[PDB]
Amino acid sequence: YQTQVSGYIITVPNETTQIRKFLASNQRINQFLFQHSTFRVELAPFAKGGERLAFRAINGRGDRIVLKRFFQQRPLTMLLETIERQLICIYLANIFNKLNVSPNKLHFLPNYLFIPSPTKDLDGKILTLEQTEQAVAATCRTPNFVEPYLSGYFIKYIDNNGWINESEFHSTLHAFAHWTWVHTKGALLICDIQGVNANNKFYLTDPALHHIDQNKFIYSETNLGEVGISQFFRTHQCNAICQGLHLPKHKEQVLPDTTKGTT
Numbered sequence: 001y002q003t004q005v006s007g008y009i010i011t012v013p014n015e016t017t018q019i020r021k022f023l024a025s026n027q028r029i030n031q032f033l034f035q036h037s038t039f040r041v042e043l044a045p046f047a048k049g050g051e052r053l054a055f056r057a058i059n060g061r062g063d064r065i066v067l068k069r070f071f072q073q074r075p076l077t078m079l080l081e082t083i084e085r086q087l088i089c090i091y092l093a094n095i096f097n098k099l100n101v102s103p104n105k106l107h108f109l110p111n112y113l114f115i116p117s118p119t120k121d122l123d124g125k126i127l128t129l130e131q132t133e134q135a136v137a138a139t140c141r142t143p144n145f146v147e148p149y150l151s152g153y154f155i156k157y158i159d160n161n162g163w164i165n166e167s168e169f170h171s172t173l174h175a176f177a178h179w180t181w182v183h184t185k186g187a188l189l190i191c192d193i194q195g196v197n198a199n200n201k202f203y204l205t206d207p208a209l210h211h212i213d214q215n216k217f218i219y220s221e222t223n224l225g226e227v228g229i230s231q232f233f234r235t236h237q238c239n240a241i242c243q244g245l246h247l248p249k250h251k252e253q254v255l256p257d258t259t260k261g262t263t
């Protein structure tokens with residue numbers, strides 16, 4: 001069974017600039033673009049786990065998407081952490097890919113929000129966080145997460161606590177994680193790197209972000225702060241991609257460099 005649902009897709013306008021600002025200063029994203037949209041959505045969830053339900057849908061531009069939601073009500077600001085995290089990961093991977101130090105390219109799935117609406121008057125408009133809260137409230141429903149559909153064999157390559165998948169080792173992914181800490185001057189590290197490998201491409205989903213500021217990602221269960229950063233580096237070996245990038249090492253690193261895998 002399926003029905004039509006109409007409402008607003010909610011994204012962040014000028015992502016790069018917003019994210020650059022969020023990282024550098026300490027100011028949360030306060031600008032959200034609303035775009036009217038109609039989805040065809042399955043009534044029955046095809047999967048659940050990691051604390052949340054998943055529904056197949058078609059975005060009417062015909063693309064296959066997945067609508068996700070936590071089991072019960074959550075405040076907008078909690079859900080926005082997932083979005084802010086994903087946007088950081090996309091920002092970082094885009095720069096990382098632009099370095100062209102590896103044939104393998106990293107692509108985190110876009111994540112946005114969807115709320116149903118009978119009306120379309122906010123179409124194309126940019127709203128503050130508070131105005132977005134009011135648009136959400138008017139619906140009186142928890143927004144859904146939306147992400148493109150991803151098929152293939154899903155692998156967890158690195159977790160958020162120093163664990164490394166051995167058989168499916170990719171030096172590109174490990175160097176990326178180290179690099180995220182270097183690029184953000186020690187402030188955060190991206191891990192829980194997991195998704196699908198095909199054609200020199202990693203399609204990555206549900207990452208974790210450790211931040212040294214105890215007030216930055218307060219709802220995230222996967223953010224272990226400075227300890228999670230230390231945990232990554234205790235088992236990290238700088239690889240040929242790290243070396244080619246001349247990444248400075250974390251003072252917890254003790255293991256010797258390795259040159260298995262890419263480059």
Ligand SMILES: [Zn+2]
Pocket residue numbers: 174175178236237238239242247
């Ligand atoms: Zn390294």
